[PDB]
Structure formats: structure tokens, C-alpha cells
Write a protein that binds this ligand. Structure first.
Ligand SMILES: CC1=C(/C=C/C(C)=C/C=C/C(C)=C/C=C/C=C(C)/C=C/C=C(C)/C=C/C2=C(C)C(=O)CCC2(C)C)C(C)(C)CCC1=O
Length: 158
């Protein structure tokens, strides 16, 4: 094991790194396909963290935009563009950020938020990241997803 100073490998840390190197479009698609692959285990009431005053208002703000505006908002989050939505997002706690993305997906399933085109093709790199995440256990999956969405938006101490 650790007797020559070697590390076998950090599956969680490495998945986070390759995810964050993806294009913005691949990031959003991979997040969506992660939701479809764990949406059963995680239950719509098992969240208990998107009905807080902070997240609820941002979700309703996005819900009212046009589909084109909604997509631009999520691209801006992933790209860390300094906009009001990105600033509001960045003051959410990390679990609230996770619950926020989960509720966006539920709103897409319900038809209130722009859907993922099923003819959007994830790139080779994106497919490799999706496969890596699907090969992690459910607990490592939570850890990766939390870090990846935690870094989105604008840092309030930026
Ligand atoms: C339109 C369009 C597109 C659209 C792309 C789009 C619209 C993409 C949208 C993607 C979205 C909104 C994905 C959401 C994913 C949510 C996940 C993985 C949530 C996991 C939650 C977890 C693990 C939470 C767990 C829990 C919670 C909640 C707690 O708080 C407590 C416990 C725990 C922490 C475990 C493209 C960009 C694709 C192409 C161009 C184009 O036109």
C-alpha cells in the first residue's frame, strides 16, 4: 500500500478534475445523465434542501424565464460568469446547491424548465467522465457531484 510513498489513485478527486475540464455543454449534459442514473435512489422528498428561502426564490426566477434564458443561466453557472443568478447561486450552501440542481431536473421532467435535447451528443471526453461517475459507488457519486456544483456560479468572497 503506502510503503514507498505511492498512491494507487483517487477516483473521486480524478473524476472531479476531468469533469471540470469538460466543455460547458458536456458538463450540463453529464450532470443531467447523472440525475437520470441516480434519480431513483435519491427521492424527491429525500432532498429537504431546495425548499429553503434562498434556493426557492432562484428556482422560481429561473422557472419564469424563457427556455433560451434558462439555458443561458445554467451555462453561466457552469462557466462562473458574474451575473445576478451566479451571485445568488454562490451564496447557497453546498447541499443547497445540490438540491437546487436536483429541483431543476424535476422541473425539466415536469415541463417547466428547458429539457436536455436527446439529440445533443456528449463528446468522447464527456462520455468517459459519465462512465467514470457511473462506475463510482453511490457515496463517491455524491461527493463528486457536490464539489462540481459547489464550484459553480460566483464565489461570494471573490
Ligand atoms: C437546451 C440545451 C442543453 C441543455 C442542458 C440542460 C438543460 C442541462 C440540465 C441539467 C440539470 C439541471 C441536471 C441536474 C442534475 C442533478 C443531480 C445530479 C442531482 C443530484 C442530487 C443529489 C446527489 C443530492 C443529494 C442530497 C441532497 C439533495 C441533500 O440536500 C441531502 C442529502 C444529499 C446530499 C445526498 C445542452 C447544454 C445539453 C445542449 C444545448 C441546448 O440547447
Amino acid at each position: 500500500s503506502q510503503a514507498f510513498g505511492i498512491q494507487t489513485g483517487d477516483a473521486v478527486a480524478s473524476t472531479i478534475t476531468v469533469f471540470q475540464a469538460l466543455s460547458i455543454d458536456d458538463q450540463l449534459a453529464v450532470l443531467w445523465y447523472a440525475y437520470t442514473e441516480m434519480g431513483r435512489s435519491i427521492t424527491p422528498a429525500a432532498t429537504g434542501a431546495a425548499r429553503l428561502q434562498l434556493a426557492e426564490g432562484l428556482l422560481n426566477q429561473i422557472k419564469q424565464m424563457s427556455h433560451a434564458e434558462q439555458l443561458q443561466v445554467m451555462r453561466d453557472l457552469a462557466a462562473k460568469n458574474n451575473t445576478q443568478v451566479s451571485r445568488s447561486y454562490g451564496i447557497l450552501s453546498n447541499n443547497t446547491k445540490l438540491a437546487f440542481w436536483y429541483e431543476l431536473s424535476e422541473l425539466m421532467v415536469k415541463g417547466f424548465v428547458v429539457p436536455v435535447p436527446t439529440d445533443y451528443k456528449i463528446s468522447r471526453d464527456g462520455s468517459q467522465v459519465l462512465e467514470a461517475l457511473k462506475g463510482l459507488d453511490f457515496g463517491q457519486q455524491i461527493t463528486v457531484l457536490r464539489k462540481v456544483v459547489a464550484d459553480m456560479g460566483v464565489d461570494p468572497l471573490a
